[PDB]
């Protein structure tokens, strides 16, 4: 079974977005009004699932092939790759990275999305990957389009891909959104701006990575992910 042998650097909740960020209208009614209650790390918080033996399909990381209905999806072919490390710079190997996104026109494959940009019959927008022994992941996909949403009267999400990362414990688990280098919608977005610190916003922006591109084939973007620093316990209960 799992053991309590590590501790994780406390989160900076002024680096992350706060709960109540009223320009993002849905946060107004979905933000707790009482303070969070701090509790000490125990085995409950410092352990979590290891997905090394979850059985992945051959195309689970390849969105150009994992919704194949007779053709390739339309849109900008890209590799999205990066490394998962902790705050001490230690790689996080054999960790679950899940991702999902809209298609090239900003349309999601969900019944609730009624945006008039059409679905792509060869695109589903869902991927997963276990990081390798050195902490690296990669997906192949098409670059998602921006799309409008019912926040302010002319609000548009920048192109983005959702990421979920498990990491070593339930204390490290994170969901975030990846944005794309140069996108002029980024500074305008009330969801991006839920993050108060401009330097934190920069950490969510994937950089064009020509070095990792397949010439005559696909471009590539790099998105590294940093999870809470993990250390050994020291001088506890003595």
């Amino acid at each position: 079974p799992a053991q309590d042998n590590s501790r994780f650097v406390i989160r900076d909740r002024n680096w992350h977005p706060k709960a109540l960020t009223p320009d993002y209208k849905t946060s107004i009614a979905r933000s707790p009004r009482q303070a969070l209650v701090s509790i000490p790390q125990s085995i409950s918080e410092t352990t979590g699932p290891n997905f090394s033996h979850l059985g992945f399909g051959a195309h689970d990381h390849d969105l150009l092939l994992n919704f194949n209905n007779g053709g390739l999806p339309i849109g900008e072919r890209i590799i999205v790759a990066g490394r998962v490390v902790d705050q001490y710079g230690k790689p996080v190997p054999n960790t679950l990275v899940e991702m999902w996104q809209a298609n090239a026109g900003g349309r999601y494959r969900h019944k609730n999305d009624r945006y008039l940009a059409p679905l792509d019959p060869n695109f589903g927008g869902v991927g997963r990957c276990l990081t390798d022994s050195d902490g690296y992941y990669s997906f192949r996909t098409i670059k998602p389009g921006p799309y409008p949403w019912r926040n302010g009267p002319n609000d548009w999400r920048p192109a983005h891909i959702y990421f979920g990362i498990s990491g070593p414990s339930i204390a490290t688990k994170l969901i975030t959104q990846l944005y794309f280098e140069g996108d002029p919608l980024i500074p305008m977005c009330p969801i991006v701006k839920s993050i108060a610190n401009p330097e934190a916003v920069q950490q969510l922006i994937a950089k064009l990575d020509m070095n990792n591109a397949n010439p005559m084939d696909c471009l590539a973007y790099r998105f590294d992910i940093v999870l809470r620093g993990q250390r050994k316990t020291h001088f506890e209960n003595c």
């Binding site: 650097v9 849905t26 209650v37 918080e45 999902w100």
Partner: protein, 200 residues
């Protein structure tokens, strides 16, 4: 002072979280292996229980797009991190609220007692992380059991909640559903009866 690399900042899971993390709940095709809401197969040791609940916003309205992750000890009080769909028991699972099904469910066993880092027993609990559109960083809570009143009273985690009235928000209510033991754990994100959320 010493400043490490900053953590990647959280963002909301958004309205379509289910397409990526709850495929069946999204009404979309599943892959061969999915992480879902059956933590225990019929043969697993321990007391088999159904858990269910609804999630409410600050206006008292149902949240129909929630995604929940749970982490709990087995009936023997041990966390099982080797996730495998062949296991009779997994300590981790996922569930969701949707437009078609506003009440999430989990199929599990009652967790055994686990000690805190100081060696003090905690009352039986399930760790929960809550995600949804409008939630910028996920909310942590614990589900405890109303038939563990003696243990709950002595729990060093529950006792960090200053007010008795707030401790009650973490206590799930035992019932029977089709003759099987169940507990309801409703979550109120904001306002009257607001559920205690933790930082750790």
């Amino acid at each position: 002072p010493i400043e490490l690399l900053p953590e990647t900042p959280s963002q909301t899971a958004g309205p379509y979280v289910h397409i990526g993390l709850a495929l069946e709940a999204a009404g979309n095709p599943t892959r061969d292996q999915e992480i879902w809401n059956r933590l225990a197969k019929p043969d697993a040791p321990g007391e088999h229980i159904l858990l269910l609940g609804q999630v409410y916003d600050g206006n008292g309205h149902l949240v129909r797009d929630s995604f929940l992750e749970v982490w709990q000890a087995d009936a023997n009080g041990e966390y099982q991190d080797a996730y495998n769909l062949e296991n009779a028991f997994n300590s981790f699972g996922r569930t969701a609220t949707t437009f078609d099904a506003g009440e999430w469910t989990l199929h599990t066993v009652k967790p055994g007692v686990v000690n805190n880092a100081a060696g003090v027993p905690m009352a039986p609990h399930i760790n929960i992380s809550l995600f949804a559109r409008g939630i910028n960083i996920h909310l942590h809570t614990r589900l405890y059991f109303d038939d563990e009143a003696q243990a709950n009273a002595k729990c060093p985690v529950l006792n960090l909640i200053e007010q008795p009235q707030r401790r009650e928000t973490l206590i799930a209510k035992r019932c029977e559903v089709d003759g099987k033991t169940a507990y309801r754990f409703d979550i109120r994100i904001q306002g009257e009866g607001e559920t205690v959320f933790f930082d750790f």
